[PDB]
């Protein structure tokens, strides 16, 4: 018996074993599938362009309406260790590619649902997991058949816009489906290093301010910071700005150590007045000798230095952030100068229309940089009607900035809309008979689970799943298999090449690879050692 021996002695193995939970049985694998299918059935309704959004409420009461699969599973309070691995699966897709975070959870729940009927037939769970590796290898090699792109980043941006429209077509930015798609294309190509095929997202600043509409979202080539002119009579428009970027506060120079400067006579106190009076005239003249007409400072200003800016016609901002001035020196081509004595004409930045824009009745007055000269840093200014449509557009356009980054890493594409999943399901079924020795049932469960993603698009579009999928799959066997999928309004024919539904190759290559390995770590587990109550 438990907690007692046959000789009457107490039988205690581990501490607090009465409040423990242990399941080996045959339902330990069944509890992992029913916990993972409910996550996949939740994310099934938010797939495709007809996917409905979800309303997420934080612990503080903040409400965020999200549609991407990365932020939905991350903002949950799920205390289930099987469903916690589905959160890290959608997070791993966002960190690597960042487009199929919703589809990688429905695919992982589809592989576990097909493995439930295979488990009742007597197949070992590692034998299903070894059969999924031999089946996912066919889906990787078949996905690299038809793949071509003609992007040159000069004038052939038409494959780049249609690739970003597939990512933005499922979000709430379909009103700006042509305007905002061209923003994310030009924001990547101006900051990407084509010699190394590396894109840095630190150069792409994504800012948002309430007011206006979604059509007022513009791609500002430069930087957008909160302007903090210390003088209210400062000119709010500079036509040709020689920007003097400095990191020294407008003050007498204070050392970093303890000084305790001694004053003995009245000649030393009169020397204190002439020291600071000549220091504020030296820090102002050393900027005017370089020909500068705009100053950026990280730290604060003194009141004595504020009026000397207006007398010399030198506008200056105050209290700029850390990485904000790092974006100014790249957008203007200037250098960040530590002191005032190291200022020169070569370390100045070049900019055109430097002005602040007031938005309605607020007092923000953000910076707008219209003209530049070969900048490697852009800033997207997202506007909207409320904060729910702006924070989602920051998440929607970030997925559009990632699919252009994946095209520079790999210039091979596929055709989405369920066209690649039906074509990959036929490749596993053709190799299931070559040979059907042991893993015949494990490969057919992989092909039946790959058809869940295109049949979820038929369910959200108001069609029938088994009626529409049987028509599309039969047309790819009777002839050579084209880019044949589905759509919501269906655009006439079902040809994905004519409807311009273009997805990246490495996006769907990591959808099958990550969902197979996450299934292998939740099939190769036969015990749960969770505790009982909290305290």
């Amino acid at each position: 018996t438990l907690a007692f021996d046959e000789y009457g002695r107490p039988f205690l193995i581990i501490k607090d074993q009465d409040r423990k939970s242990r399941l080996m049985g045959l339902e330990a694998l069944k509890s992992h599938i029913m916990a993972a299918k409910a996550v996949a059935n939740t994310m099934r309704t938010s797939l495709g362009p007809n996917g409905l959004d979800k309303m997420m409420v934080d612990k503080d009461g903040d409400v965020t309406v999200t549609n991407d699969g990365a932020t939905i599973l991350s903002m949950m309070d799920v205390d289930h260790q099987i469903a916690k691995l589905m959160v890290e699966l959608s997070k791993s897709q966002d960190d690597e590619i960042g487009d199929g975070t919703t589809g990688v959870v429905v695919l992982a729940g589809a592989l576990l649902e097909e493995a439930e009927q295979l488990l009742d037939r007597g197949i070992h769970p590692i034998r299903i997991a070894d059969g999924y590796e031999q089946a996912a290898r066919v889906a990787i090699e078949h996905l690299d058949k038809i793949s071509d792109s003609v992007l040159v980043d000069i004038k052939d941006t038409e494959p780049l816009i249609q690739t970003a429209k597939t990512t933005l077509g499922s979000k709430v930015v379909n009103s700006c489906h042509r305007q905002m798609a061209e923003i994310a294309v030009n924001a990547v190509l101006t900051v990407a290093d084509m010699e190394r095929r590396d894109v840095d997202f630190e150069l792409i600043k994504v800012e948002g301010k309430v007011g206006g509409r979604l059509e007022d979202t513009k791609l500002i080539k430069g930087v957008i910071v909160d302007k903090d002119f210390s003088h209210p009579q400062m000119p709010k428009k500079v036509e040709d700005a020689k920007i003097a970027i400095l990191t020294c506060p407008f003050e007498p120079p204070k050392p970093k150590t303890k000084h305790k400067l001694d004053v003995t006579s009245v000649e030393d106190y009169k020397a204190l007045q002439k020291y600071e009076k000549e220091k504020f005239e030296e820090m102002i003249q050393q900027i005017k000798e370089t020909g500068a007409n705009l100053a950026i400072c990280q730290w604060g200003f003194d009141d004595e230095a504020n009026h000397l800016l207006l007398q010399n016609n030198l506008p200056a901002v105050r209290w700029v952030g850390g990485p904000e001035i790092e974006l100014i020196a790249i957008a203007t081509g200037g250098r960040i100068v530590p002191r005032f004595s190291e200022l020169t004409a070569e370390k100045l930045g070049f900019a055109g229309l430097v002005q602040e824009i007031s938005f309605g009745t607020t007092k923000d007055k953000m910076l707008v940089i219209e003209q530049c000269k070969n900048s490697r840093a852009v800033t997207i200014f997202i506007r909207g009607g409320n904060k729910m449509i702006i924070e989602e557009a920051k998440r929607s356009l970030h997925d559009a900035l990632c699919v252009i980054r994946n095209l520079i890493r790999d210039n091979r594409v596929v055709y989405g809309g369920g066209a690649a999943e039906i074509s990959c399901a036929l490749a596993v079924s053709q190799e299931a008979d070559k040979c059907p020795t042991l893993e015949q049932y494990a490969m057919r469960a992989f092909a039946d689970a790959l058809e869940v993603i295109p049949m979820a698009l038929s369910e959200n579009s108001g069609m029938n799943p088994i009626q529409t999928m049987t028509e599309v799959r039969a047309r790819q066997v009777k002839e050579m298999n084209p880019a044949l999928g589905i759509d919501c309004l269906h655009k006439g024919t079902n040809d994905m090449k004519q409807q311009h539904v273009i997805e990246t190759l490495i996006g769907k290559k990591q959808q099958i690879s990550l969902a197979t390995q996450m299934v292998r770590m939740i099939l190769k587990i036969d015990d749960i050692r969770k505790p009982g109550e909290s305290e």
Binding site: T1, L2, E6, Y7, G25, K30, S31
Partner: protein, 537 residues
Amino acid sequence: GPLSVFGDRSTGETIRSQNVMAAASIANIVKSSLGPVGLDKMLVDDIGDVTITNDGATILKLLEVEHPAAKVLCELADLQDKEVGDGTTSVVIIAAELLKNADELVKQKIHPTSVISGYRLACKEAVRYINENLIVNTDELGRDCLINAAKTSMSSKIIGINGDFFANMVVDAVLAIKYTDIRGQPRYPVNSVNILKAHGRSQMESMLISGYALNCVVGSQGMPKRIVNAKIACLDFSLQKTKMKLGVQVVITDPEKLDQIRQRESDITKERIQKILATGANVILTTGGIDDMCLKYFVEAGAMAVRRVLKRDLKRIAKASGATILSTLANLEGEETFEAAMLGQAEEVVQERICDDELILIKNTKARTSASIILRGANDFMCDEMERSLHDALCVVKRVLESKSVVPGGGAVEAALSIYLENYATSMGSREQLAIAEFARSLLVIPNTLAVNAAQDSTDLVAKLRAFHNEAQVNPERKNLKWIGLDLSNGKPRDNKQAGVFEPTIVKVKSLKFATEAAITILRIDDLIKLHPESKD
């Protein structure tokens, strides 16, 4: 998703390991009370009652259990008393070791239905081998078989003396109650021996009363307490005043007729007491009640009247003394006849001194010459132990006289079956041979427990025990080593034929049949569902 039952469900090898520990929790208790080197226990209740016993049935009946696999072994000991009567520590150890060795088989991914079918091929072969390897019936040994079989049962209890005092009283008790039946059935009803207890002198003063020992008093202290050449009148009706029934009421319309009805309730009562006493009856036994008015007629006439005796005691007296159990008046519309020729007979009815109580004895009863045993012990705890040890000793000589066949005790049967079943598993064994091979190792726990409780050598004495039994089966040179047992006082294998260690045949045949059948039911608890207690709703 899962089952929505409000109780508790445990599947797999969890219950398959819990039932073995439930059976081993009972076997490890009674392992210290087996054989002549076994020791008694103490059973203390919550109210303060102390019960000192070593029998396998009295311990497990008073002990509370909760597990469903534990109630099978506790009810297995209760069946051994009715079927055999001394075989009720050995069945519990075998039936728990049958589950311990079968648990090692089902952990080797062997199906339990092959273990159940493998146990039936070994249980039926064990009864077949023990019925073809007996020594002799009760004709060659004579009275030496009944005494030596009685001393084997007493060796595990408080009456295991070196002499033959308690052994001769049991054989003389069963041989005096030989009741014949139809179609040649010499039955020996051992329940007719009234076993009485009294805290008196030592165990060597236990009287063997040839007759019956009634546990009652005379009542009125004016009757002669010793009647020689007595005539027992066994009757069952209350000798009280004539009370009318519910349907009869006394509605008098004349005041002169009042006192004649009041005297009629005692005149009809005394009319029965004068016609049962004028026929020479001196001893009157009554299961009802004799009130103080009717006790005068026995003091005046000089007769003994015993009131409020048991109904089970009146049948043992009237059958042994030739008396007729009469409940009312009878014999073809007769007023008061009583059938005086059907009175009982007795040589002497004497109330002796039983250490500050009154006990009535009947000497030889003149018709059947029955027997009753009065036990004498130090305290009441020894008298309850002496009663249980004597009742198990009466059941041993009952089965020997009925079924004239004895087997050697002290592990001699379990040693011969441990080697014959290993050769039996090799001949016709394809997939169930592992269950027959573990049936032989489970039977070896009976000589193994005799070596543990004696603090002797364990893995060498039993290894020397089966060395003689192996040569008695593979070397046909008339070695006659089938009766090799254990000498627990010396620590060497001895011959149980000359030593006088005899046990009945059905104390091991019914033990191997009940332990194998109980091991099948506990082997099929692969799934167990326990619901919540429905007490307060």
